[PDB]
Each structure stands twice: as structure tokens, then as C-alpha cells.
A paper describes a structure:
We set up crystallization conditions both under oxic and anoxic conditions and we obtained crystals of [name] in both conditions. To obtain a nucleotide-bound structure, the crystals of [name] grown in oxic conditions were soaked with 10 mM adenosine-5′-[(β,γ)-imido]triphosphate (AMP-PNP). [name] and [name] assembled into a symmetric hetero-tetramer consisting of two subunits of each protein related by a 2-fold symmetry. The [name] subunits consist of a right-handed β-helix core domain (residues 33–289) connected by a short linker to a helical hairpin that serves as an anchoring point for [name], analogous to the coupling helices of the transmembrane subunits of ABC transporters. The first N-terminal 32 residues of [name] are disordered and were not included in the final model. The two [name] subunits tightly interact through an extended dimeric interface, which together with the two [name]-[name] contact interfaces stabilizes the hetero-tetrameric assembly. Most of the interactions between [name] and the nucleotide are similar to those observed in other NBD structures of ABC transporters. (b) Close-up on the binding site of the AMP-PNP/Mg2+ showing residues surrounding the binding site of AMP-PNP.
Numbering used by the authors:
A (entry chain A), D (entry chain A): -2 to 239
B (entry chain B), C (entry chain B): 28 to 157, 474 to 632
Write the structure that this text describes.
């Protein structure tokens, strides 16, 4: 649909993604508007991860039918670096471990130009991001983002990376799982911080309770967007239909 | 100014040892005979130094050293090699290390070389560890041209010993890296870890033969090897595992070749191009980052 | 009754080939010369059989076979060896397999032996895979006494080839297992996996040399080795990885020795004793469970 | 305390567990009564896993001070097998992968004597357990409990194993995480089934929402049981104190 495209950041039109002989996404229609926290709910194996990797341009996740438009440009021929330079980034669910990369240097990668420039401002933005994800900056700044960290520490550092990057679109694959969340008030405090800065979040989750804190929610069932709109209406449909 | 052994060219510049740490040293014209003895009970927590400088052409720095640690002793040695001229250099170290009952030895060698590869660094280290002993070794050659590296180690461990050996290398131009380490866990509950990290570029040649023998009950070992390949570099990894006890367990993991796709794609999702992302992974791999 | 090749003792009992599958066979007194040719386009989805029975004392079953698969062809071979008497037996197979452009070959060999270990199973297989070809190999020797196993394979792969080699062994008494496999990924995007699973008990001796050469861009390889050690068994694992391209990636993982502590403790949490839990892990390892 | 011990299945008295130089559990007092779903809440690194491994008798998790009494017997000298033969079992959080063990044979391991005996009854109990954890029995019975399964499939098979085992005490390390839970009604249906059979569950969790469905809840903070009792009272304290 080309109505209200002037306020649309991302537009996935009838997307078909195949992984070998199997079709995972069977016609995905999804849009992300400016300054919106749009959540995606669905059961295990519905294609939540597949969709997130296809938008980011991860190798192997190539669409057969359909198009992905970001910032009015069809990114069909754009690679991961080119899509990231447009303002789009991804969380993963299991953030990759890196040999010999310190947290202080990792949080500088992809950092927004409004922080990256001044030295004393970039170093302060790192502290603000680590304090937001409940990590003691002095206890983690000189730690490596390697296998040595716990899954919760590494996923919290990935959330802090999103904060330092401050992207136009942040695709977050299961931000509340892997951190063994105590309460949604801690994840909401990060989501609201990014939203106040002008970011749009494409939060991928299986937890209906997390989706209720988003502005809009889309239910993906077997590679198709069944219901969309109000988080509580589509949430009530998710509790009954499968 | 600190318990140190200085060797500039093929001559001993200084030989000074403190209380409980006997440092003997002599020269047989080109060949240096050193003998370090850590006395029973002496646990020095501050690191000893060992500097090797070579600025002259055609130098054959051959050093035969014997390090003995008596029961309950402790020492950490930080060897530094600075070879910036690099024409006709040959640093050869032949060592025999004997770690006593409940003693602890730690060795860290760093190299800083120039851009000419007519250097040959050849350490040969035999290590014998008694009941409860600890051996920690770290060889890092990531600055300038390595030239030709030829490391050879053989460690024999008795009851409750602990071994941690690490190698970080960065081979460029026509560099040759040869690492041959063997660890024999010959005592009950002796544990070992051999870790190799590095990046090979241009026309370099790497050969890494790392071996663990689990010969006693409850002896555990782990070989972790990772080597990045760029340009026309060639790498050969030969990690041997021998198990001669039903209560011994050795595991090994290795990754040779191009950088991990998920790691590359994670850094490219931060706006870094394929070359910047690979350079970051390689710099972190060699310990620069 | 099915396209099969029967060999009882050192004589060919039957040699019958269907349409598009040429089966030639002759005897040079003890030596069997076979030649299998799968015609261009013929994709047989039903498996061909190859039975080898030995009940006589001192039999030297030497078979030289050549398997050629033409462009776009497909065949699956299920070899069965039944050696229950096991006195003076020697099954030697020397094979040359040539897989054409977009052809697919699959081989599955199972052995059923008696309790006497005077048997020598010696397969030597050279495999040449063309652009788009597929090779799947599975050798299983977990029934009775192996005797002496000596497997030797060398696979050469071109553009877009796929190789999957697996070995499941159960060595008991004074059994000797020798596995030497080499896979050379010599074409763009050629992929390989070598998997070894097994358990060694009593006074058995295992030697597993598995090698992958990543010589072309986008060639990928993975060696997965796992061998349980019980009693006085000895295991030696030598997994060589050679990389000659900056866009090639090979990884290897191995675990030799006692069973994983978490796996043992998980089964012991189900009420199983240490011996029952180990027997379950070992049975699952050798494919019994 | 030796008052009301006649209705106590498990009794952990002032437990101190050290992992090297660090003391993880610093005096744990916790009891599990008969036919009770007792949940344990706490932040990451509080010692939830450590406590679960110490009760089960996992190697390395040896108490320095304090005692664990199960069924009136001090199990200080009992190994994992001996504790499991008393009716105590554990879930893990990351259930171990096994080479060549089918789901149908794995679910038989440790199976209760009331099912294990009759062949047609044991085979039916497996189907009932897999149907309870929302897995299609015919799609999983001949699958291996190896690396091939997803984390959700393997943890659901571990939940089905608990069902077939029907232990007197089932220690469940994070039963709702790793399955990417759609709703608590699916985990409650399994918990109530075990409770109706006479089982006691020691549910270890970080999610306060999961603990409210339990009979009693204990809050572990830095190796110590701070508050205990009503799930909503101790839950309100968990939201504020850390
Ligand atoms: N490595 C892989 N091999 C085979 N199939 C895969 C692989 N990765 C993903 N898939 C397929 O992708 C689909 C699952 O989509 P995905 O978006 O990853 O899951 P999901 O619904 O997000 N669940 P979760 O991963 O728990 O968050 C299934 O049809 C899988 O078969
Ligand atoms: N392998 C290990 N090495 C070092 N410390 C460990 C290890 N395993 C556990 N610990 C320690 O155990 C404590 C964590 O307790 P544990 O019960 O595992 O965590 P938790 O609170 O349950 N969190 P979670 O694991 O997310 O459920 C910390 O003090 C860790 O340092
Ligand atoms: Mg996912
Ligand atoms: Mg835990």
C-alpha cells in the first residue's frame, strides 16, 4: 500500500523467504512507522527470527517474492553494511561472542554521529548505556565480549550497543529473553529512552505480556501476519488462536 | 631496580639475583649459560624481567637456561625481545624448567620486531611439573615481521598439576610460524589447557602441532585453536589427543580459515564494511583491540 | 529379487545388473574384479545390495571394484558383511569411485561378526567428485569382535560438491581400529563433514586420522569426533586441517576419553547408577539405543 | 527447625556452598513440604542454580556448612543416583544433549514404577507426557535428544521426562525459560497435573509472574533467603528490594 508512506520507516510487502525446499515466510505484510515501538508476537517456529534476518539482509535469508522498502528505498540489492548505514540495526537473540574485543571498544562500534564525534561525550554515552541496562560500567568496561560473559551480561551489552548506536530502526530479537528479566519496568525504561530519542523499535517476542507495552502489535503465525493493531486486541486473539 | 637478566647482542649485560632467587650466568663465547633457582617457600608476587635486545647485524643470541623452583615457591618471568634492525638475527633459547611440589611458574614473552624478516626466534622448552605444581606460558609475536618462529615445548605433569599455555601470533609478508607443543598428563587429576590464537596474511605459512596425553585417572585437557587466513596464507593445524585412562578426558576445538559469518555479520550490522569488520575481528584475535 | 552382488567365501555367487546400471564381475582366482556403471540420467531411489559372507577358515576375500556415476545419475549401495566363524578371515576391498557432474552416490556398510577376532576388514576407497556431485559414506562395526579394522579414504572434490562421511565403531577385547580419511575440497563452494562416533573398551587400540584441505574459495569443512574410553583402551585422534584460501573455512571438534560429566549426571538424576548411565551413553554413541 | 517435620519432604538447614574461593550460598534455610509447589525467585547470580545442584548432589556443589535432609534422612553422603532413588530429580535449565538416544527411550529412563511395569501402560504414559508439553508424539518419538532438537523442544522433552518419572520432589531449574512460553496457562496445566499426582515441585525462576501460580515462594538474594511465604507478598518485596 502506497497510502501514508510519508510516515513509514519500513515496509515489508508480501514477503516470501525460502530456506531450501521449505517456505518459512509465506507472504509477510508488515510496516514500521516513525517513532513507533512495533512488536511482533508468535509461537516458536512461526518465522519471527527469519523475518528479522531478512530485513537486516543476513546472507541466506534472501526473498524469492516480495519487497522490503526502508526510508523509501527498496533495499533488495543493499548488503548488511549498506542497510546499517541507512539507520537499520539488529539484536540477534544470541549475540555473537568475539575474541579480544573489550566492552568499551565494542560499544563504540556503530555509535551515533551525535556521540561518536566528541571524545568526552562518546565515553560518557557508554556509561549512560551500561547504567541503563543495569550493568556497573566500571565492572564491565575492560571485560571482553567473549564466551567469558554470561548470556545475560552479553545480551545486556547488546542492548547498551543499541543505545550507543541510536538507530532509526532497531530490530530487537527477543530483548527480554536471555537476560532472565526480573520485571518489565527495567526493559520499558530502555524502550522509552530509545523512543524519546526518535528511534523506532521492531521488537520480536513470544511473550504477550511484553507486547502490551508497545504501540502496535502484529501476530505472525506460520509465516503470515494474521491480526494487527491494538496490543490487547491482537493479544486476546493470540491467547485463543494458533 | 628489579631482579632482571639483560642480554644486549650475544653478551650478558647484567646478572643480579635477590634473596631466595639464585641467578647464575656465564658466557662460553656466544653461548649464554643461565641458571635460576627459586628457594623453598619463596613466593615472589612481583615479576622478574629478562630483556633481549639485538641491533647488530648477524647476531646468534643462543641462551641455555635452567629454571628450578623448589617446594612451595612462586615466580613470574616477563621476557621482552626487541629486534628492530632484524638483519641476520637469531634468538635461540633452550630451556629446562623444573617446577617442584606445590610450586608456581609463569612465563610471558613479548616480541617487538622491525619490518625485515631475517629473524629466527627459536625457543625449545622442556617442563617437568611435580605434585601440585603450576605452569603458565604465553608467547606473543604480533609486532612487525616475525621472520621465522619455531616454538617447541614438552611438558610432563604429575598429580594435581595445572598447565595453561597460550600463543598469540600475527604473521605477515613471507613469515613462517611453527608451533609444536606436547603436554603429558602423567599424574592423577593433572589439568591442562593449550590455547592458540592468531591471524595469517600475505604469503605466510603456519604449522601448529598441539598435543595432549591423558595418561592418568581424572586428568583433563582442552585444546582451543583459532587461526584466521587472509590473502595467500597457508595454515596447517594438527591437534593430537591421546587417552590412556578410562577416567581421563580430553577435548579439542579448532576453527581455521575465514572469520565466523555471524561475527562478521554482527559487526556489519553496526555499519562497518566487510574490511573494517574483518580488521576488528583480526585485531581482537591478536590482542590489539 | 533386486540388483545385488553376492560374494560367499572368495567366489562370486551372483552378478546381475538392471537397465541403466551396468554390473560387470570376474574372478582372477581369489581376486574379484567388479565394475559398476550408472548411466547418465538414471536416478535409482531404491538401494542396491552387496552381500559378503565368510564361514570358511583362512579366506582372503579381495575385491577390486570401480564405481562410475555419469552426469545427473543417482545410486545408493548397502553393503552387508557377515563373518560369524571369524578364523583366518580377511576382507579386503580396494575401490575407485568417480562421481560425475550432478551425480549422487551413497554407501552404507554394516558388519556382523563373531566373538573371535582373527578378522581383518581393510577398505581402501579413492573418491573423485565432479561439479555438483554428492558422496555419502557410512561404516558401522558395532557387532561382535571387529578384529582389525583398517579404513583408508581419499576424496577429491570439485565445484559445489557435498561430502558426508561417518564411522560408528565398538571396539572390545584386543580389537584394533585404524581410520585414515582425507578430504580435499579443491573446488569453489565444495562442502564436507566427517563424523566419527565410537566406544573403545578392554584392551582395544584406536587411531583416527581425519583430514580436510580447504583449497578453494567458499569451501567449508567440519570434523566432529567423539570416542569413549573404558578399561585399558587406548585412543589417538589426529584431526588435520589445511586451509589454502582466504574464503575457505574449516572447523573441528573432538571429545576423547570418559563420558561427559553433565550427560552422566543427567542420567544419574533419573535413578540410573554410574554403570547403567555410562552404558546408555555408550549404546547411544554406537547407534544401539 | 524440627517442628512440623512430619509433613516436610525437603529441609535445607543453614547451607554454605563454596565454589573455589567464593562463597555462593551464605546460609540457605529452605523447606519443601508434601504436595507443595514451592517457587524460588531471585535475580541473576543469586545462587538459584547452585542451590538446585547442591540438593541434587551434583559433583563440585558440596556444602561446607549446613545439612540437606530429604525424607527424614540426611543425604550428606548420598550420591546423585542414591538421591534419585529416594524420589528426587532435577531439570537443569539447559538439559544435556545425548548422542543416539531416542525420545521414546529417553522418556523411559527413571519412569515411575506405576507406569514402567506394564508395557502398554508405559508406552501410553509417554504419549500423555508429550501431549501435555504440546509436542506431537508421532513427530518426536523417533527423534534423538541430541543437538538436532531446538532448545524449546529439548526443554519440553525434559518436562515430559519429569511427567513420566513422577518424582516425590521435582526440582525445576527455569521451566518457563528456554521454551519461549506463549502463556502461563500451558505451564500451569503441567504443574497442576504433577500436583494432582502427589508431587512436590521446587520451581527455580527469575519471573515473578510465574511464582504467583505456586503455593509458597522464597526470595533468594546473594545466597540468602530474605523473605518467604505468600507469593504476592514476597513478590511485592522482590519488585522493590535488591
Ligand atoms: N539453521 C536452520 N536450519 C533449518 N531450518 C531453519 C534454520 N534456521 C531457521 N530455520 C527454520 O526457520 C523457521 C523458524 O523461524 P524463526 O524465526 O527462526 O523462529 P521463531 O518463530 O522466531 N522462534 P524462536 O527462534 O524461538 O524465537 C522454521 O521453519 C525452521 O525450520
Ligand atoms: N562455572 C562457574 N564458574 C564460576 N562461577 C560459577 C560457575 N557456575 C556458577 N558460578 C557462580 O554461581 C553463582 C550464580 O549462581 P546460579 O544459581 O548459577 O545463578 P542464578 O541466580 O540461578 N542465575 P541464572 O543462572 O540466570 O538462573 C555466581 O556467584 C557464579 O560466580
Ligand atoms: Mg528468534
Ligand atoms: Mg539457573
Amino acid at each position: 500500500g502506497e497510502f501514508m508512506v510519508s510516515i513509514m520507516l519500513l515496509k515489508v510487502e508480501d514477503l516470501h523467504v525460502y530456506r531450501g525446499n521449505r517456505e518459512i515466510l509465506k507472504g509477510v505484510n508488515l510496516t514500521v512507522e516513525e517513532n513507533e515501538i512495533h512488536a511482533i508476537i508468535g509461537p516458536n517456529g512461526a518465522g519471527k527470527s527469519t523475518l528479522a534476518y531478512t530485513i537486516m539482509g543476513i546472507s541466506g535469508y534472501k526473498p524469492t517474492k516480495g519487497r522490503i522498502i526502508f526510508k523509501g528505498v527498496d533495499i533488495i540489492d543493499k548488503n548488511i553494511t549498506e542497510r546499517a548505514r541507512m539507520g537499520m540495526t539488529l539484536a540477534w537473540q544470541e549475540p555473537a561472542r568475539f575474541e579480544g574485543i573489550k566492552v568499551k571498544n565494542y560499544l563504540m562500534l556503530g555509535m551515533n554521529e551525535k556521540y561518536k564525534k566528541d571524545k568526552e561525550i562518546a565515553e560518557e554515552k557508554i556509561r549512560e548505556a551500561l547504567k541503563l541496562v543495569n550493568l556497573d560500567p566500571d565492572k564491565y568496561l575492560d571485560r571482553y565480549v567473549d564466551e567469558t560473559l554470561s548470556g545475560g551480561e552479553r545480551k545486556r551489552i547488546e542492548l547498551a550497543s543499541i543505545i550507543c548506536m541510536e538507530p532509526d530502526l532497531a530490530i530487537l530479537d527477543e530483548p527480554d529473553s536471555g537476560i532472565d528479566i526480573v520485571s518489565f519496568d527495567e526493559i520499558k525504561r530502555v524502550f522509552d529512552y530509545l523512543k524519546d530519542k526518535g528511534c523506532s523499535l521492531l521488537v520480536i517476542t513470544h511473550r504477550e505480556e511484553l507486547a502490551e507495552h508497545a504501540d502496535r502489535v502484529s501476530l505472525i503465525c506460520a509465516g503470515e501476519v494474521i491480526k494487527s493493531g491494538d496490543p490487547k486486541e491482537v493479544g486476546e486473539f493470540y491467547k485463543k488462536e494458533c | 631496580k628489579g631482579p632482571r637478566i639483560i642480554v644486549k647482542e650475544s653478551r650478558i649485560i647484567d646478572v643480579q639475583g635477590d634473596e631466595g632467587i639464585i641467578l647464575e650466568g656465564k658466557e662460553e663465547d656466544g653461548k649464554i649459560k643461565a641458571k635460576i633457582i627459586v628457594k623453598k617457600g619463596y613466593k615472589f608476587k612481583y615479576p622478574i624481567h629478562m630483556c633481549f635486545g639485538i641491533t647488530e647485524e648477524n647476531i646468534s643470541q643462543i641462551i641455555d637456561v635452567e629454571i628450578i623452583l623448589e617446594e612451595d615457591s612462586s615466580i613470574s618471568l616477563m621476557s621482552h625481545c626487541s629486534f628492530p634492525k632484524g638483519k641476520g638475527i637469531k634468538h635461540i633459547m633452550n630451556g629446562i624448567i623444573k617446577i617442584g611440589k606445590n610450586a608456581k611458574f609463569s612465563y610471558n614473552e613479548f616480541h617487538y620486531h622491525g619490518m625485515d624478516g631475517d629473524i629466527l626466534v627459536k625457543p625449545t622448552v622442556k617442563v617437568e611439573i611435580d605434585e601440585g605444581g603450576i605452569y603458565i606460558s604465553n608467547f606473543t609475536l604480533t609486532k612487525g615481521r616475525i621472520g621465522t618462529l619455531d616454538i617447541e615445548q614438552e611438558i610432563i605433569a604429575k598429580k594435581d598439576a595445572i598447565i595453561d599455555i597460550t600463543t598469540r601470533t600475527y604473521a605477515i609478508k613471507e613469515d613462517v610460524v611453527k608451533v609444536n607443543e606436547v603436554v603429558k598428563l602423567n599424574g592423577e587429576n593433572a589439568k591442562c589447557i593449550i590455547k592458540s590464537r592468531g591471524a595469517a596474511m600475505d604469503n605466510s605459512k603456519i604449522s601448529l602441532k598441539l598435543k595432549i596425553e591423558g595418561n592418568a585417572p581424572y586428568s583433563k585437557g582442552h585444546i582451543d585453536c583459532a587461526e584466521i587466513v587472509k590473502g595467500n596464507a597457508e595454515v596447517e593445524s594438527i591437534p593430537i589427543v591421546v587417552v590412556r585412562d578410562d577416567k581421563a578426558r580430553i577435548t579439542h576445538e579448532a576453527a581455521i580459515g575465514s572469520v565466523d559469518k555471524k561475527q562478521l555479520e554482527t559487526l556489519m550490522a553496526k555499519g562497518l564494511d566487510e574490511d573494517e569488520a574483518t580488521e576488528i575481528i583480526v585485531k581482537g584475535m591478536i590482542g590489539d583491540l
